Every structure is written in C-alpha cells, then in structure tokens.
Amino acid sequence: GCCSDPRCAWRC
8 A cells, every 4th residue: 555565664
C-alpha cells in the first residue's frame, strides 16, 4: 500500500 517494496524494510 504505502511503500511495501524490495527497497523498504521498516520505512512505510
């Protein structure tokens, strides 16, 4: 939804 992505772990 927000980030939820390979680059994001605890980000959005």
